[PDB]
Paper text:
The LPs are localized to the OM where they are attached via a lipid anchor by a process known as the localization of lipoprotein (Lol) pathway. The ABC extractor presents the extracted LP to the transport protein LolA, which binds the anchor and thereby shields it from the hydrophilic periplasmic milieu. At the periplasmic face of the OM, the LP cargo is delivered to LolB, which completes the Lol pathway by inserting the LP anchor in the inner leaflet of the outer membrane. As most Gram-negative bacterial pathogens, the genome of the phytopathogen Xcc contains genes coding for a tripartite Lol system with an ABC-type extractor, the LolA chaperone and the OM insertase LolB.
In the present study, we present the experimental crystal structure of the LP-free LolA-LolB complex from Xanthomonas campestris pv. campestris. The crystal structure of the Xcc LolA-LolB complex was determined in the trigonal crystal form R3 with two LolA-LolB heterodimers in the asymmetric unit. LolA-LolB heterodimer 1 (LolA1-LolB1) consists of chains A and B, and LolA-LolB heterodimer 2 (LolA2-LolB2) of chains C and D. In both heterodimers, LolA and LolB interact in a “mouth-to-mouth” orientation with the LolB hook inserted between the two β-sheets of LolA, similar to what was first proposed by Okuda and Tokuda. A six-residue long loop between β3B and β4B in LolB (residues 74–79) forms a hook that inserts like a wedge between the two β-sheets in LolA. An annular opening is formed on one face of the LolA-LolB complex. In the lipid-free LolA-LolB complex, both paths that lead from the annulus to the hydrophobic cavities in LolA and LolB are closed off. The path leading to the LolA cavity is blocked by residues in the LolA lid domain and the LolB hook, and the path to the LolB cavity is blocked by Trp81 in LolB. The LolB hook (residues 74–79 in chains B and D) assumes slightly different conformations in the two heterodimers to allow some conformational freedom when docked to LolA in the absence of bound lipid. Due to the different conformation of the LolB hook in the two non-crystallographically related heterodimers, LolA and LolB in heterodimer 1 (chains A and B) are slightly more tightly associated than LolA and LolB in heterodimer 2 (chains C and D).
Residue numbers in the entry:
A (entry chain A): 1 to 125, 129 to 188
B (entry chain B): 19 to 198
The structure:
């Protein structure tokens, strides 16, 4: 059973800090992009994706705005934070009740990759389908497939439960020279 | 210009023009006025044919533009609504995302080559005889840093900024892939 794991994991969860590795693969499983870094989560709508290798990129959701910062390009994109549970269900962990609201959740029967999976089929409008993989230490993997068949597989390790965050963990601090742009449509 | 630098730039261009299938991966930041965007770019070229994938950061959603520089047409797949197509691939991309990138001219500019049959290009050379700035087709293209050469791979740009009025493109090319 996999829903057991999600609820044991997000049992009394206010914050989350850990490391990730990300592999983007094509239909035949060949890795096309691979990177790693740090991920942090805090209720009710704050996250931070810190890419470290092979380039630095910072994504921060401060609760009201989402910032995408690329240091090498000296530009940050800002937009208002709307419903970010249909762009990354990882925030739907710190509030587990959200998952069943925008996602037709469904538990796979066959264990895969050594893990018990939940299929997150989307109702709200994102991606085509997510899947959360749970193992001995909690959430171990997340997988998302987009409309042109490209899959992103994100693995996790070093989870620290409810930590003491620095007060800028979920804030974007501009550096001098950086272009600040809105999100084009 | 130095005579050795003259010959090196002529051999760089002739080698590239003689190998029209290639690709690169890098990162792009677009801007027009106060809005814009960024993402990871995979660009595959096969003569006049291009296949361009942009992988978005938080959305996680990539789009794929395919077009042809001899017609100028392109098609754009992967966005909500379904696939869009039209006679001008730059305009297809513009209407669908709000991004301006001169896609029909990039296959030459990103290699620091000027377009053929396009109208005389103003070219400024750096101290080694490599293009530093190219003016062509309404756009000003700056070559800020170069990828190291090897026996198999001629000098190719690594950081480009292109501007047309208030439309701005910044490109970092992280990895080239070429014919042997």
């Amino acid at each position: 059973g996999a829903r057991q794991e999600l609820d044991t994991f997000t049992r009394g969860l206010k914050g989350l800090d850990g490391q990730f590795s990300q592999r983007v693969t094509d239909a035949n499983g060949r890795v096309k992009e691979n990177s790693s870094g740090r991920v942090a989560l805090a209720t009710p709508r704050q996250f931070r994706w810190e890419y470290a290798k092979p380039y630095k990129q910072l994504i921060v959701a401060d609760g009201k705005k989402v910032w995408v910062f690329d240091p090498d390009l000296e530009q940050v994109t800002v937009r208002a934070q709307g419903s970010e549970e249909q762009n990354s269900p990882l925030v739907a962990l710190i509030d587990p009740t959200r998952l069943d609201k925008q996602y037709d959740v469904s538990e796979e029967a066959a264990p895969r990759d050594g893990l018990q999976w939940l299929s997150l089929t989307p109702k709200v409008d994102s991606f085509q389908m997510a899947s959360l993989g749970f193992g001995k230490d909690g959430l171990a993997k997340m997988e998302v497939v987009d409309a042109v068949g490209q899959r992103t597989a994100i693995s996790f390790s070093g989870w620290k439960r409810n930590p003491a965050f620095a007060a800028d963990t979920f804030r974007y601090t501009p550096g001098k020279g950086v272009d600040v742009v809105g999100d084009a449509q | 210009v130095s005579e050795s630098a003259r010959q090196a730039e002529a051999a760089r261009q002739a080698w590239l023009q003689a190998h029209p299938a290639w690709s690169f991966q890098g990162r792009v930041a677009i801007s027009k006025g106060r809005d814009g965007g960024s993402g990871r770019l995979d660009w595959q070229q096969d003569g006049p044919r291009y296949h361009v994938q942009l992988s978005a950061p938080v959305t996680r959603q990539s789009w794929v533009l395919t077009g042809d520089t001899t017609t100028g047409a392109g098609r754009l797949e992967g966005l909500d609504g379904g696939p869009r197509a039209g006679a001008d691939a730059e305009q297809v991309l513009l209407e669908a995302t709000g991004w301006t990138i001169p896609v029909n001219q990039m296959p030459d500019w990103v290699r620091a080559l000027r377009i053929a049959d396009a109208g005389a290009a103003r070219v400024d050379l750096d101290e080694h005889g490599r293009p530093r700035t190219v003016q062509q087709d309404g756009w000003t293209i700056d070559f800020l840093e170069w990828t190291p050469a090897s026996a198999a791979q001629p000098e190719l740009p690594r950081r480009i900024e292109a501007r047309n009025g208030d439309a701005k493109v910044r490109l970092l090319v992280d990895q080239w892939t070429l014919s042997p």
